[PDB]
C-alpha cells in the first residue's frame, strides 16, 4: 500500500478534471449560464497551481502525511459539497477547495516516495506516480463523458470520495504575494484581450516583491528548467488533433485512436525509462519527441498513405515523453534535499504545469494567427514548427543538467 495509497490521491485529481469536459450537463443542474458555470470548474487548477508551493511548504513544515491526510479528507468535502447540493454560488466554493486538495497532495505524496523508497525503490515508486498522473489525466476527458452520458455528471464525484477514503484506508512568508503573482500569471495565459498588458505588470511586480522577501545550484534546477521547456510541446497534440479533424476531415474516434495510441505508448515507456536508468535517457526523450513533431509536421505536405507519418509521430512523440518522465521525476526528487522536499516537489510540479499552459497558449495563438494569414495545412506547420523550437530548447535545457 505504498503506491496504492499515493495513486488513490493522484486519481482524486483525475475525477476533479473530468467534469471540465462535461460542462453542458452541469449547465442544466446548477442552472446558471455558461462562462460563469465553466470558470467555476476552472478554479480547481487555477488555485492548485498557485498554492502547490505553499501547500507543499506547509506539508514540508507541519507533517508530510499530515497534509496528504488533509488533502484526501479535503477531497471528500471538495466532492460531497458539489454532488449533494445543485446551486451555483455553492459550486465555486467546492471547486476552489478541490484545487487546494491537489496543492496539498502532489508535493507531500511526492516527498513520501523519497522516504518510502530511498534509492532503487524510488525508480519503481515515481514510475507508479507517473502512471497515476499521465494515465489519469490521459483518460479524464474520455472518462467524464462516458460517466455523464450513462450514469450522470454527479456519478463522477461519488467515485471521488470513495477512492479518497480507500487512499487513507490503504495507508505565510510571502505566500500571499506568490499566489497573487501566480493567479495573475495563470489568467495571463488565458488571453481574452489591451487589458492583459496591466495583468502582466502585477506578475512582474509581485515577482520582484517575492524575489526580495532559495539558493538552488544542483542538477534538480536543470531537471525543473528542462521539465518546463519539455512540457512546452504539450500543444503538439492539441494542434495535431485539430489539423487531423478540421484539415483532413477525420471523425472524433480516429482522432481519439491516434491520441490513445500516444497514451498507451507514453504509459509503457515510463516503465522502460525506469530500466533506462539519468541525463542519457532525458536527452533521448527530448530528442525523439522533436522527430515525433517533425513526423506530424510533414503530414501538412502529404499523400494518401501519409497517415503513417502522422501515426508513427504520435508513437515517436508518446515514447519520448515516457523515456524522459521517469528518469526526470527521479533526478529532481533525488537531489531535492530530505530537509526540504515538500517545497522542492511543489516547484517541480508547478514548473511542469506552467510549462503546459505556456506551451498550449503559444501553440494555439500561432495556429490561430498562421491559419488566418495562410491556410489550415500551412498554418499547422508554423504552429508544429514552434513546438520543435521548444523541443530543441528542451534538448538544449539538459546541457545545464550534468551527470
Amino acid at each position, epitope marked *: 500500500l505504498i503506491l496504492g495509497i499515493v495513486l488513490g490521491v493522484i486519481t482524486f485529481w483525475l475525477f476533479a478534471q473530468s467534469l471540465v469536459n462535461v460542462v*453542458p450537463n452541469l449547465q442544466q443542474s446548477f442552472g446558471t449560464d455558461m462562462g460563469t458555470i465553466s470558470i467555476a470548474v476552472s478554479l480547481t487548477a487555477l488555485f492548485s497551481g498557485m498554492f502547490v508551493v505553499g501547500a507543499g511548504g506547509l506539508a514540508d513544515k507541519i507533517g508530510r502525511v499530515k497534509m496528504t491526510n488533509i488533502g484526501l479528507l479535503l477531497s471528500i468535502i471538495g466532492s460531497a459539497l458539489i454532488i449533494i447540493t445543485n446551486l451555483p454560488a455553492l459550486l465555486i466554493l467546492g471547486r476552489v477547495i478541490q484545487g487546494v486538495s491537489a496543492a496539498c497532495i502532489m508535493p507531500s505524496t511526492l516527498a513520501i516516495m523519497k522516504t518510502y523508497y530511498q534509492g532503487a525503490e524510488r525508480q519503481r515508486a515515481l514510475s507508479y506516480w507517473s502512471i497515476g498522473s499521465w494515465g489519469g489525466s490521459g483518460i479524464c476527458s474520455l472518462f467524464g463523458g462516458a460517466v*455523464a*452520458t450513462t450514469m450522470g455528471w454527479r456519478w463522477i464525484f461519488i467515485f471521488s470520495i470513495i477512492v479518497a477514503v480507500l487512499s487513507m484506508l490503504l495507508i505565510v512568508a510571502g505566500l500571499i504575494v506568490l499566489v497573487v503573482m501566480l493567479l495573475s500569471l495563470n489568467v495571463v495565459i488565458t488571453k481574452g484581450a489591451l487589458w492583459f498588458f496591466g495583468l502582466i505588470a502585477i506578475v512582474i511586480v509581485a515577482f520582484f516583491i517575492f524575489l526580495n522577501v532559495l539558493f538552488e545550484n544542483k542538477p534538480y534546477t536543470g531537471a525543473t528548467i528542462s521539465n518546463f521547456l519539455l512540457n512546452g510541446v504539450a500543444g503538439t*497534440l492539441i494542434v495535431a488533433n485539430t489539423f487531423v479533424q478540421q484539415g483532413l476531415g477525420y471523425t*472524433a474516434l480516429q482522432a481519439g485512436y491516434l491520441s490513445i495510441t500516444y497514451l498507451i505508448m507514453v504509459l509503457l515507456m515510463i516503465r522502460v525509462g525506469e530500466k533506462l536508468l539519468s541525463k542519457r535517457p532525458m536527452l533521448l526523450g527530448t530528442f525523439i519527441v522533436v522527430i515525433g513533431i517533425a513526423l506530424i509536421s510533414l503530414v501538412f505536405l502529404p499523400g494518401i498513405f501519409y497517415v503513417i507519418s502522422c501515426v508513427v509521430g504520435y508513437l515517436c512523440f508518446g515514447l519520448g515523453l515516457g523515456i524522459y518522465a521517469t528518469p526526470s521525476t527521479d533526478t529532481a526528487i533525488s537531489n531535492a534535499p530530505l530537509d526540504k522536499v515538500g517545497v522542492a516537489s511543489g516547484i517541480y510540479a508547478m514548473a511542469s504545469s506552467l510549462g503546459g499552459a505556456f506551451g498550449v497558449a503559444i501553440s494555439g495563438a500561432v495556429y490561430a494567427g498562421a491559419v488566418a494569414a495562410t491556410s489550415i495545412h500551412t498554418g499547422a506547420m508554423i504552429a508544429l514548427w514552434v513546438n520543435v523550437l521548444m523541443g530543441i530548447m528542451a534538448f538544449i535545457a539538459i546541457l545545464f543538467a550534468i551527470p
Partner: nanobody, 131 residues
C-alpha cells in the same frame, strides 16, 4: 479569440431554397473533445428559437420540429464549414438566422440545442420569404 464568420441567406419567393453557411475561425479541438454548431432564428415579433445543429466530431445532427425534413444541416468537411440547406420555405421561416457554437466538450456527450448551452454567436444573417 474565436470568430464565427457566416454567409448566405437572403430574400426569395415562398416554397423556394436558401443556403446558409457558417465557419469557426481558430476554434481548436481538445485532446478528446469536439463542439456543436447550428442556427437560431428570431422574427421581429417572436422570441429566439433554435433551427438546426450538428456536432463537428461525428456529424450527429438535430433539428426543431418546425423545419424537420425540409432543412438539412451538414458540414463540408474538407472545406471546414457547416451549412444549413433550407428548402420548401414558408413565411414562418422569415427571421434573422444567427449561427452559434458552444464551449468544447467530450465528443461522447450528445449534440446540443438549447440557447443557454451555446456561447459563441454571430452578427446574424437575414432570410425572408414572400408570395
Amino acid at each position: 479569440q474565436v470568430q464565427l464568420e457566416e454567409s448566405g441567406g437572403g430574400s426569395v419567393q415562398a416554397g423556394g431554397s436558401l443556403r446558409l453557411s457558417c465557419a469557426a475561425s481558430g476554434y481548436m479541438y481538445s485532446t478528446y473533445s469536439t463542439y456543436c454548431m447550428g442556427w437560431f432564428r428570431q422574427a421581429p415579433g417572436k422570441e429566439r428559437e433554435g433551427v438546426a445543429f450538428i456536432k463537428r466530431g461525428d456529424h450527429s445532427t438535430y433539428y426543431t420540429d418546425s423545419v424537420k425534413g425540409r432543412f438539412t444541416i451538414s458540414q463540408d468537411s474538407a472545406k471546414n464549414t457547416v451549412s444549413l440547406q433550407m428548402n420548401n420555405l414558408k413565411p414562418e421561416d422569415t427571421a434573422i438566422y444567427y449561427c452559434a457554437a458552444d464551449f468544447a466538450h467530450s465528443f461522447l456527450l450528445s449534440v446540443h440545442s438549447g440557447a443557454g448551452q451555446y456561447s459563441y454567436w454571430g452578427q446574424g444573417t437575414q432570410v425572408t420569404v414572400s408570395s
